[PDB]
Amino acid sequence: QLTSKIISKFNYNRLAFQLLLNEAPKKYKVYYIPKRGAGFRVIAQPTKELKNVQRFIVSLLQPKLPVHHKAMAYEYKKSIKDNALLHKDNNYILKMDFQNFFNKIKPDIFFSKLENTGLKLDSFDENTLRNLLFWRPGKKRSTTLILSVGAPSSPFISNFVMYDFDKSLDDWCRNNGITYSRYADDITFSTNIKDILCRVPKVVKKMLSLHVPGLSINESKTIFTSMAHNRHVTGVTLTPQGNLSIGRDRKRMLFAKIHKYSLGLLSSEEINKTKGMIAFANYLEGDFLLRLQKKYGCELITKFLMEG
Amino acid sequence: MWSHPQFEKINKMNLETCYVDFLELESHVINEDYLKESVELQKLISTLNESKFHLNKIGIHDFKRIRELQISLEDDLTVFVGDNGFGKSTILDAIAIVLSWLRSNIEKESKPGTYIKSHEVNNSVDVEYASIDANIKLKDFNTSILITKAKEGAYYSRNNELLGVKKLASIYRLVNKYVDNASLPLMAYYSIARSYIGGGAKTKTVWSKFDVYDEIEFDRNDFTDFFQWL
Amino acid sequence: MNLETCYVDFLELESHVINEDYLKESVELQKLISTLNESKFHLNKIGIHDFKRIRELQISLEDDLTVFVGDNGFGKSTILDAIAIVLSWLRSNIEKESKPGTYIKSHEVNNSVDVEYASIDANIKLKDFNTSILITKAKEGAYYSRNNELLGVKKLASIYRLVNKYVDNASLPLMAYYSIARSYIGGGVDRKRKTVWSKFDVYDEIEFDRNDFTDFFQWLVFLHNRASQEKLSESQTTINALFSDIQSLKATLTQLSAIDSTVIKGLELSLKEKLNYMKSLQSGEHKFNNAVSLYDSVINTILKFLPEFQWIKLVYGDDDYKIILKKGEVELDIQQLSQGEKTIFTLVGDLARRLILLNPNLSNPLLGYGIVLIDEIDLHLHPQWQQTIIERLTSTFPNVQFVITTHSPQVLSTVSSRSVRILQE
Amino acid sequence: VFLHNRASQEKLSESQTTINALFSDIQSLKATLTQVIKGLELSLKEKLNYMKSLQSGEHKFNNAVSLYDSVINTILKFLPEFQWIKLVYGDDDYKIILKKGEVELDIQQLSQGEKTIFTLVGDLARRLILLNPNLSNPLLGYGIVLID
RNA sequence: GCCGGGUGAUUAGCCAGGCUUAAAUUUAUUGUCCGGUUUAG
């Protein structure tokens, strides 16, 4: 029983819950966000009343749906740093990307995976689930539901959905000395053997068609890299020696910002911006503050940190 | 193709940044006298003039006889050698296909181009769709484009990617709007059907540079207009 | 009650109710028909912006007659064809939804460097209903693109489509345009060398042409033969035997099928003719209209415009036909007439035919609604005829909006002062 | 198409009394015409011509199937890559199907080089096969050919 | 050899100029108001 728990927790009466059930898909707001460069992006986010119940729902299904350990997105105690530590000691790297990943998940494929796990659920809970976690764009007669993004429940659902693809591709990559990892809709491979990475584009396509029909690969976002060019994994640069880094351009920018701050020419907004950037870089490297202290002295750094 | 609060990040000199700085300055000043002498327009024009048009690479997947391959083209000359039935004309057709969308968008935005014919997909049982990818590198700037078509009878959808070529075409239109005699790139194609025009109009009066953008292929009547122009 | 409110409740009733008979007998249908029946079609005003040679112009049109006097370089004809472009979109949508119309060609936008796009806009008032339409096009290579808005026209055309879809024998607005080339087309009377006249045949073009007069002659012959046979009172039993002969022809076609593109086309044409004959029989059951009265009226108006001629008779004399007019004590065919009389003959014979076909049912089909654009009213007319043409046009067709450009003082003197617009440079 | 139609009816039989059936077709056409007219008369004449199959009556070694085999085998000599060429009836229409390697091909999808040879050789054999109706091997006539 | 990448250190410091090192034709740093990660109050 699942509908009883949600009704009891939020102390909803019969008529109110029914009224919300058939109007839940349309309580979304569509807006644009600026792009880094030129253009815009499309987002759609629910209301306050539907968000705090979606979060409650995902708490019940968290300890019941297995997720593969090669997915490093929206997971507790996992981040980019753990993602880049797998490929930090290999020479050749290949990167791929999907096409409209989030709108290819539908209740037809969602319930098929639920049936395979051995969990049996009532028809009423099926109706409640179908009409709560899904979005209906277009007219009221479209009868098409898409998972969408910006909702609290979508990221967890995607990881559970792609479990078979992760498992079927990981053990194939293990047998050929290839490292594999996925972040949201990015897949990365790395190896030390020459001329072995030219065969995996057909393999991923075959597993894609065999395990999750409907999905497809974007063919204009494929990249091959080696140690003689720029290498990075989701925003962290890899030194040829094999060390994580943030980049020389940002190191010089932060040094210039601190130097200008020593002359008292920094506005209050930039103090907060640089403090946050410095904290992130310190977490990424681990020895950034020592280098700054050895250059401008401990007193100035301490005063800058304590400001505000 | 829009205006932003001018995100800063690190400092650079990319053509895109100069394009968006001019757009940002547009929303404040209204008088055209200041606009025609602003240093941002001079920066944009100077950057655009020294760039050289160059197609970087191309990749063909499951199109006609070709199953999958990638080609890198030289910047001045490249020659393909082969026998009959080895897909020599397929590569040229693919290049003209991806070049027609750029041709179309210059005359007017959101205008369609050329699609894939239903008989061009491979005849193998296991195929599901066909795709073409490309890349254009003007100096530092890089753009990409993908064209695809699903096999008839399937129930799974695939669409096109067109943000890069629309962004690039907007720069050309904006420059042409403030320059009296701005130039344009040249695209042409001489197929095997040019031997028919081997020596086989209501008093045309006005000549413009947009009449050569009617088609990407030389065929039939272009010889007659040449005589009228001469 | 506004027609929009009567529209929405009918839409709801149609969506809910399913019985066709109930929908036909529904009160909402009767109210909608009554409201649509009396609604004077009227163009309020029109503005032109950077079209051809005109830079800016805003003008208001009268509801009964307006004369565009005053020569100028931009040319009066451009205004008339500007209105023709706007009117072209309404009929296309009436024939079928989302049908395109006439676009503005890129070679008519102004050549001055300042301009970047051209636009024409206008407003149509139907009692209290108000619709507006704008047609625009930008020059090649412009930074911004411009598109037309057709929500108002599509909405207006929907009620016309629905009325014909439910009720039958409905009437549609008249739109016509007589250019200056009618002299040549009308003058082809000398040699210049279908059975079921539907309603949409005239709803194909707006500009007068030679083929219109060619269609006119055949229409006259068909009306004459139909009236003569009805007057002779062919036996009703014989008429039913003709229907059984059409059934026998259908049986022969079935035998042909149970044995050929030409054969299939002929069978389809025969089936269409049989269906038209069955519809005519159904109309005949309700006593139909009066063929002799319409054939009399169409001749009578022409004779009204040419007082010298005594009478006109078809006088076929076997063959196909040979129309004969009696001038004094002589008989002459149309190929023997004068240049001035030919233009009047074709103009009136075209307007009368258009009102007859477009507006059936109505007891006097000469009282229809519409708008007529005619240029160079004073072509090949002596001054005696020039002072009476307006009176007869405004008396024979009292409910049609007229737009006229004039050139001579004789026409100008007769008209009033509230209907004359003077264009100055 | 006409060669294949006569090939199946005459050489492969599967027609029983073809002369009687075609004569009954002519009679049916006349009856239908009795109870577009020019087309019907032309169809009746065509049915009478088909009814003249027994009038011809040769069934010799140079039958329709032998001509079909000779034409196809002649074409295949100039195109060593291909395996077989066949005529396929479907969707109320006929199409030419070619075998290359392990893939089936239509006629529109060939290259220009194999199109030129296919057209030239086919027309050359069509004229000899059509102007010499008595030779045991009709590719043995006399003439002159000019090629540029 | 040449070119293109990595960056600790220097400089009224996103400059500039110095010292190292890496290689099949083979990166062009991306989405907030949601999600998890870092810091702080």
Ligand SMILES: Nc1ncnc2c1ncn2[C@@H]1O[C@H](COP(=O)(O)OP(=O)(O)OP(=O)(O)O)[C@@H](O)[C@H]1O
């Ligand atoms: N849909 C298809 N499926 C499989 N093979 C195809 C298909 N379409 C074409 N082909 C193959 O294409 C080959 C010819 O390709 P193409 O015309 O590009 O080559 P080409 O002879 O080098 O060119 P050209 O002579 O036109 O310069 C044929 O041999 C045919 O087998």
